[PDB]
């Protein structure tokens, strides 16, 4: 009984490649970006960095 | 020695439905290897769940269009042969009393 309780406040969403306020997502990769150049960059990226970003902030993908 | 009464099954702990214990027993008794891992039966049960769910969903969809409330071998046959993935997975199998898909070649059709 010394660990902090789970937060009841919803957690914001941030761009996985620029650290800015995200407002969209991506069904093909399940990541989040902020602008058009972010979308082009994330599409140009291979699967290795995508799965690394997904595993960083752990998600339904291992 | 005291133990928990009516302990939970491994299938329920895994969220699956096929018997993980029976799969593990079959793996151990089948002499595929001298030692069988821990998570292998769970994974195999999950794959079997997926396959059974897919084939049964398709069979039920096929049977619904035939105004029938019960699955028969014909509905399974129609379900498998109409999906390319399941057809190539089950290329060399024979379904008993399942008939053949109805298809006519363009040349043999009148006019």
């Amino acid at each position: 009984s010394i660990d902090a309780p789970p937060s009841f406040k919803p957690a914001k969403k941030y761009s996985d490649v620029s650290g800015l306020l995200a407002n969209y997502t991506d069904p093909q990769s399940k990541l989040r970006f902020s602008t058009i150049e972010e979308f082009s960059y994330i599409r140009r990226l291979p699967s290795d960095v995508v799965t690394g970003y997904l595993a960083l902030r752990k998600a339904t993908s291992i | 020695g005291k133990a928990r009464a009516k302990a939970k099954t491994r299938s329920s702990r895994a969220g699956l439905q096929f018997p993980v214990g029976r799969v593990h027993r079959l793996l151990r008794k089948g002499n595929y290897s001298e030692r069988v891992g821990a998570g292998a039966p769970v994974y195999l049960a999950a794959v079997l769940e997926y396959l059974t769910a897919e084939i049964l969903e398709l069979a039920g969809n096929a049977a619904r269009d035939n105004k029938k409330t019960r699955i028969i071998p014909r509905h399974l046959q129609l379900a498998i042969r109409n999906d390319e993935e399941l057809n190539k997975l089950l290329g060399r199998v024979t379904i008993a009393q399942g008939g053949v898909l109805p298809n006519i070649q363009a040349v043999l059709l009148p006019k």
Partner: protein
């Protein structure tokens, strides 16, 4: 009459099987040839089905024997056991 039972596979039966196969016209020389083919197939399954009956020291051929015989020839059968 003393007649071989391969001729027991009647011509209408072969026509029915062909029509299930999707053929419009049937030449007259198929009828004797197909029976021959039907022989060869039964010469590659029963032979196996008997051997399993040998290995179990049994005298009655069971459905499991024929299912295993068909399984090894890449012609697996569903719904008759196994």
């Amino acid at each position: 009459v003393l007649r071989d039972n391969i001729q027991g596979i009647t011509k209408p039966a072969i026509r029915r099987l062909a029509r299930r196969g999707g053929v419009k016209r049937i030449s007259g020389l198929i009828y004797e040839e197909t029976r021959g083919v039907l022989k060869v197939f039964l010469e590659n399954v029963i032979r196996d089905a008997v051997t399993y009956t040998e290995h179990a020291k049994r005298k009655t051929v069971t459905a499991m024997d024929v299912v295993y015989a068909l399984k090894r020839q890449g012609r697996t059968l569903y719904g008759f056991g196994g």
